[PDB]
Design an enzyme around this catalytic site. Structure first.
Site, PDB file in Angstrom:
ATOM      1  N   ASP A 103       0.886  -1.181   0.000  1.00 13.29           N
ATOM      2  CA  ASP A 103       0.000   0.000   0.000  1.00 13.29           C
ATOM      3  C   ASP A 103       0.914   1.218   0.000  1.00 13.29           C
ATOM      4  O   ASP A 103       2.135   1.076   0.174  1.00 13.29           O
ATOM      5  CB  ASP A 103      -1.013  -0.008   1.142  1.00 13.29           C
ATOM      6  CG  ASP A 103      -0.497   0.194   2.552  1.00 13.29           C
ATOM      7  OD1 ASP A 103       0.649  -0.191   2.803  1.00 13.29           O
ATOM      8  OD2 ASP A 103      -1.289   0.701   3.370  1.00 13.29           O
ATOM      9  N   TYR A 163       3.031   4.847   0.621  1.00 13.52           N
ATOM     10  CA  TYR A 163       3.746   5.417   1.751  1.00 13.52           C
ATOM     11  C   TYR A 163       2.776   6.119   2.660  1.00 13.52           C
ATOM     12  O   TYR A 163       1.921   6.888   2.229  1.00 13.52           O
ATOM     13  CB  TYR A 163       4.800   6.408   1.338  1.00 13.52           C
ATOM     14  CG  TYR A 163       6.018   5.831   0.702  1.00 13.52           C
ATOM     15  CD1 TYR A 163       6.885   5.020   1.426  1.00 13.52           C
ATOM     16  CD2 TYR A 163       6.350   6.097  -0.609  1.00 13.52           C
ATOM     17  CE1 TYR A 163       8.009   4.448   0.845  1.00 13.52           C
ATOM     18  CE2 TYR A 163       7.499   5.598  -1.184  1.00 13.52           C
ATOM     19  CZ  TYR A 163       8.335   4.741  -0.472  1.00 13.52           C
ATOM     20  OH  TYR A 163       9.463   4.195  -0.981  1.00 13.52           O
ATOM     21  N   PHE A 214       6.615   2.638  -4.267  1.00 14.74           N
ATOM     22  CA  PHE A 214       7.951   2.910  -3.717  1.00 14.74           C
ATOM     23  C   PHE A 214       8.608   4.180  -4.198  1.00 14.74           C
ATOM     24  O   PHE A 214       9.599   4.617  -3.623  1.00 14.74           O
ATOM     25  CB  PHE A 214       8.897   1.698  -3.866  1.00 14.74           C
ATOM     26  CG  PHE A 214       8.348   0.479  -3.206  1.00 14.74           C
ATOM     27  CD1 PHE A 214       8.415   0.329  -1.838  1.00 14.74           C
ATOM     28  CD2 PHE A 214       7.695  -0.493  -3.951  1.00 14.74           C
ATOM     29  CE1 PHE A 214       7.905  -0.801  -1.219  1.00 14.74           C
ATOM     30  CE2 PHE A 214       7.143  -1.593  -3.313  1.00 14.74           C
ATOM     31  CZ  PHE A 214       7.285  -1.768  -1.959  1.00 14.74           C
ATOM     32  N   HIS A 252       9.111  -8.261   2.211  1.00 16.62           N
ATOM     33  CA  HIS A 252       9.043  -6.844   1.811  1.00 16.62           C
ATOM     34  C   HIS A 252      10.287  -6.076   2.276  1.00 16.62           C
ATOM     35  O   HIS A 252      10.868  -6.389   3.314  1.00 16.62           O
ATOM     36  CB  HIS A 252       7.741  -6.312   2.432  1.00 16.62           C
ATOM     37  CG  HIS A 252       7.308  -4.939   2.057  1.00 16.62           C
ATOM     38  ND1 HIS A 252       7.935  -3.844   2.594  1.00 16.62           N
ATOM     39  CD2 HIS A 252       6.272  -4.550   1.267  1.00 16.62           C
ATOM     40  CE1 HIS A 252       7.271  -2.777   2.124  1.00 16.62           C
ATOM     41  NE2 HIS A 252       6.239  -3.190   1.313  1.00 16.62           N
TER      42      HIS A 252
HETATM   43  O1  LIG Z   1       4.549   2.313  -2.328  1.00 12.70           O
HETATM   44  C1  LIG Z   1       4.813   1.706  -1.277  1.00 12.70           C
HETATM   45  C2  LIG Z   1       5.301   2.407  -0.114  1.00 12.70           C
HETATM   46  C3  LIG Z   1       5.341   1.656   1.151  1.00 12.70           C
HETATM   47  O2  LIG Z   1       5.519   2.224   2.247  1.00 12.70           O
HETATM   48  N1  LIG Z   1       5.165   0.319   1.057  1.00 12.70           N
HETATM   49  C4  LIG Z   1       4.734  -0.379  -0.039  1.00 12.70           C
HETATM   50  O3  LIG Z   1       4.439  -1.569  -0.002  1.00 12.70           O
HETATM   51  N2  LIG Z   1       4.591   0.358  -1.178  1.00 12.70           N
HETATM   52 CL   LIG Z   2       4.458  -8.292   4.662  1.00 14.27          CL
END
Ligand SMILES: O=C1CC(=O)NC(=O)N1
Ligand SMILES: [Cl-]
Ligand SMILES: [Cl-]
Length: 229
Positions: free
Chosen positions: A70, A72, A83, A193
């Site tokens: 999701d 930032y 990201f 992640h």
């Molecule tokens: O675009 C993003 C930013 C984040 O904090 N974490 C994610 O998984 N994607």
């Molecule tokens: Cl995760």
């Protein structure tokens, strides 16, 4: 334009508008969800006009998709491409600094000048999140609110194209797309992640960039030019 008010033909690139037709009503429903959040006094990120930005690059040109969780959670970071941050943002978000540490370890390239990932988006990489909005300061706050059907549809449509695809799935929410990638023209790379909370369980050392390129070459596709300025 606004996701409640205007059709996919206006909101996203032509190929994406056809690919997302099964979720046209669901995208309008998300626009109503976001309107209700503002009415209630809650905020969301990224800005409304950036929420669908990943789908503004050509569907037909995607060779690799990167999927995170999701956007930032800090105001001023999310830009609708997973990201990525605007070229004037410093310091980089910690997840992005971790991505760039892996980028330099895997590819041998110098650290990038800034956190803008638009070159990747302009070179055939789809920068997707499983969920496309978040409330400020609250990661995962919009999980289960309707975005998952939209990103599922996007992956199914890409997988059905008569073209090679490589998916890089970062974290658990992204890896719920794996079942949709079963067809023989598609291959998925999965890792923990790059968040500081999970990166040391297997993000670092995963070599996703070089591996995606080796997979594209084994399918007879052109590798991604990952080099950032
Ligand atoms: O675009 C993003 C930013 C984040 O904090 N974490 C994610 O998984 N994607
Ligand atoms: Cl995760
Ligand atoms: Cl809020």
């Amino acid at each position: 334009a606004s996701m409640t008010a205007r059709p996919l033909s206006e909101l996203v690139e032509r190929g994406w508008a056809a690919a997302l037709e099964p979720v046209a009503d669901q995208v309008a429903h998300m626009g109503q969800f976001l309107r209700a959040e503002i009415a209630a006094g809650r905020r969301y990120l990224p800005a409304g006009s950036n929420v669908l930005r990943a789908f503004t690059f050509p569907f037909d040109n995607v060779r690799v998709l990167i999927v995170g969780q999701d956007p930032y959670p800090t105001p001023g970071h999310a830009v609708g491409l997973s990201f990525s941050v605007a070229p004037d943002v410093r310091p980089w978000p910690r997840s992005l600094a971790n991505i760039f540490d892996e980028y330099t370890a895997d590819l041998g390239y110098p650290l990038p000048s800034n956190g803008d990932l638009t070159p990747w988006a302009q070179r055939g990489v789809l920068l997707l999140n499983r969920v496309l909005t978040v409330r400020p300061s609250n990661p995962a706050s919009h999980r289960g609110k309707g975005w998952e059907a939209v990103t599922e549809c996007a992956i199914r449509a890409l997988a059905a194209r008569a073209a090679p695809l490589v998916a890089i799935l970062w974290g658990r929410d992204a890896s719920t797309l794996k079942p949709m990638l079963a067809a023989g023209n598609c291959v998925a790379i999965e890792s923990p992640h790059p968040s500081p909370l999970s990166a040391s369980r297997g993000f670092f050392g995963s070599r996703p960039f070089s591996r995606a390129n080796e997979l594209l070459v084994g399918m007879g596709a052109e590798p991604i030019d990952w080099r950032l300025p």
